[PDB]
Scaffold this active site. Structure first.
Site, PDB file in Angstrom:
ATOM      1  N   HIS A 192      -3.723   5.782   3.505  1.00  0.00           N
ATOM      2  CA  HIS A 192      -4.380   4.524   3.112  1.00  0.00           C
ATOM      3  C   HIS A 192      -3.753   3.294   3.747  1.00  0.00           C
ATOM      4  O   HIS A 192      -4.439   2.439   4.271  1.00  0.00           O
ATOM      5  CB  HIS A 192      -4.306   4.318   1.603  1.00  0.00           C
ATOM      6  CG  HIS A 192      -5.034   5.334   0.798  1.00  0.00           C
ATOM      7  ND1 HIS A 192      -5.121   5.256  -0.578  1.00  0.00           N
ATOM      8  CD2 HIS A 192      -5.732   6.435   1.158  1.00  0.00           C
ATOM      9  CE1 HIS A 192      -5.832   6.277  -1.029  1.00  0.00           C
ATOM     10  NE2 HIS A 192      -6.206   7.010   0.005  1.00  0.00           N
ATOM     11  N   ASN A 214     -13.973  -0.294  -6.525  1.00  0.00           N
ATOM     12  CA  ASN A 214     -14.984   0.698  -6.166  1.00  0.00           C
ATOM     13  C   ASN A 214     -15.754   1.205  -7.393  1.00  0.00           C
ATOM     14  O   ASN A 214     -16.149   2.363  -7.420  1.00  0.00           O
ATOM     15  CB  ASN A 214     -14.327   1.885  -5.478  1.00  0.00           C
ATOM     16  CG  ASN A 214     -13.678   1.535  -4.161  1.00  0.00           C
ATOM     17  OD1 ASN A 214     -13.928   0.482  -3.589  1.00  0.00           O
ATOM     18  ND2 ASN A 214     -12.870   2.447  -3.658  1.00  0.00           N
ATOM     19  N   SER A 239     -11.162  -1.118  -0.320  1.00  0.00           N
ATOM     20  CA  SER A 239      -9.859  -1.067   0.361  1.00  0.00           C
ATOM     21  C   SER A 239      -9.966  -1.274   1.855  1.00  0.00           C
ATOM     22  O   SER A 239      -8.997  -1.716   2.467  1.00  0.00           O
ATOM     23  CB  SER A 239      -9.185   0.283   0.146  1.00  0.00           C
ATOM     24  OG  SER A 239      -8.597   0.311  -1.142  1.00  0.00           O
ATOM     25  N   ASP A 296       0.843  -1.206   0.000  1.00  0.00           N
ATOM     26  CA  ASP A 296       0.000   0.000   0.000  1.00  0.00           C
ATOM     27  C   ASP A 296       0.876   1.253   0.000  1.00  0.00           C
ATOM     28  O   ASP A 296       2.026   1.199  -0.431  1.00  0.00           O
ATOM     29  CB  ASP A 296      -0.976  -0.081   1.208  1.00  0.00           C
ATOM     30  CG  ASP A 296      -2.306   0.584   0.940  1.00  0.00           C
ATOM     31  OD1 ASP A 296      -2.320   1.817   0.605  1.00  0.00           O
ATOM     32  OD2 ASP A 296      -3.383  -0.030   1.068  1.00  0.00           O
TER      33      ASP A 296
END
Ligand SMILES: [Ca+2]
Ligand SMILES: [Ca+2]
Ligand SMILES: [Ca+2]
Ligand SMILES: [Ca+2]
Ligand code: NA
Length: 309
Positions: free
Chosen positions: A71, A168, A249, A34
């Protein structure tokens, strides 16, 4: 300190409305690929084991994995935050070991070759250390990168369990992206904190699988696999504080944490065994609400919502 100990999605996956702390995951490594992780976050620091940056140089810079976005820290927190000294936030598997692999580079983010190098490295580490690794990839694209695909397959062959965001780009059918849509990645759909038709509801944004391969309780390329909490998820943030955001996520690390919690109780099980246990657990919690959700294995929610109990 945190303003929540056990966020709604933690309580949901633990299936306990009054949960005050979590447990489990000992010995299992969750590799969060990430934007990096704040390894000094009070609710993460004690679980930090590896911290490697695949966005600077090849192959990576060791002892470096700085998150300047949030994130990666957020995702890590849902998977394995440990409550700090008792007042912080808890993730699903607070005894798991965090391998913070920065693959989304400053700033903007992520080159396929960096992500692929990190996936391969996680597999190589699983082999070299003779240890169990759950990769979490809370990232996606509509297009399939062969570098990332081949790396996923390489790691999976080496016994690594790979969990990824579904994407998404929902709610329309066939919106699932990569690496989630890979046959050797567990694509996780996002649930919201709404009960409808007796179950948690899939969020409209969550990417859907393909109609022609759905309903068989067998994962092919393009199938959503399981569902987990992903909307309005409170977790750790890169600044040492907290944040609330929504995405597949956010769902992925709930599942990766659950996988680690499961694996820690059967440490000689293979990735395939643990994946099968997730599938079984999901199947008994059939998700019945959200666009294209219904009875059985569906494109919105896959097999269902794997829980602790
Ligand atoms: Ca370890
Ligand atoms: Ca590079
Ligand atoms: Ca299928
Ligand atoms: Ca269903
Ligand atoms: Na998949």
């Amino acid at each position: 300190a945190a303003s929540q100990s056990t966020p709604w999605g933690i309580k949901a996956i633990y299936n306990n409305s009054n949960l005050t702390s979590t447990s489990g995951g000992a010995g299992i490594n969750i590799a969060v690929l990430d934007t990096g992780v704040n390894t000094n976050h009070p609710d993460l620091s004690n679980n930090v084991e590896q911290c490697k940056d695949f966005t600077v140089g090849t192959n990576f810079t060791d002892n470096s994995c700085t998150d300047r976005q949030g994130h990666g820290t957020h995702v890590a927190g849902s998977a394995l935050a440990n409550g700090g000294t008792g007042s912080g936030v808890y993730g699903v598997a607070p005894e798991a070991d965090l391998w913070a692999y920065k693959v989304l580079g400053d700033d903007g983010s992520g080159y396929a070759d960096d992500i692929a190098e990190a996936i391969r490295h996680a597999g190589d580490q699983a082999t070299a250390l003779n240890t169990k690794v759950v990769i979490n990839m809370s990232l996606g694209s509509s297009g399939e990168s062969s570098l990332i695909t081949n790396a996923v397959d390489y790691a999976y062959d080496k016994g690594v369990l790979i969990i990824a965001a579904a994407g998404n780009s929902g709610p329309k059918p066939g919106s699932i992206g990569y690496p989630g849509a890979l046959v050797n990645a567990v694509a996780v759909a996002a649930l919201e904190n709404t009960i409808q038709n007796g179950t948690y509801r899939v969020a409209d944004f969550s990417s859907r699988g393909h109609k022609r391969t759905a309903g068989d309780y067998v994962i092919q390329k393009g199938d959503v696999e399981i569902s987990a909490p992903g909307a309005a998820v409170y977790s750790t943030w890169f600044d040492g504080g907290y944040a609330t955001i929504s995405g597949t996520s956010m769902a992925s690390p709930h599942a990766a944490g659950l996988a680690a919690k499961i694996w820690a109780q059967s440490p000689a099980a293979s990735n395939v065994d643990v994946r099968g246990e997730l599938q079984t657990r999901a199947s008994v919690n059939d998700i019945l609400s959200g666009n294209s959700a219904g009875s059985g294995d569906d494109i919105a929610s896959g097999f269902g919502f794997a829980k602790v109990q």
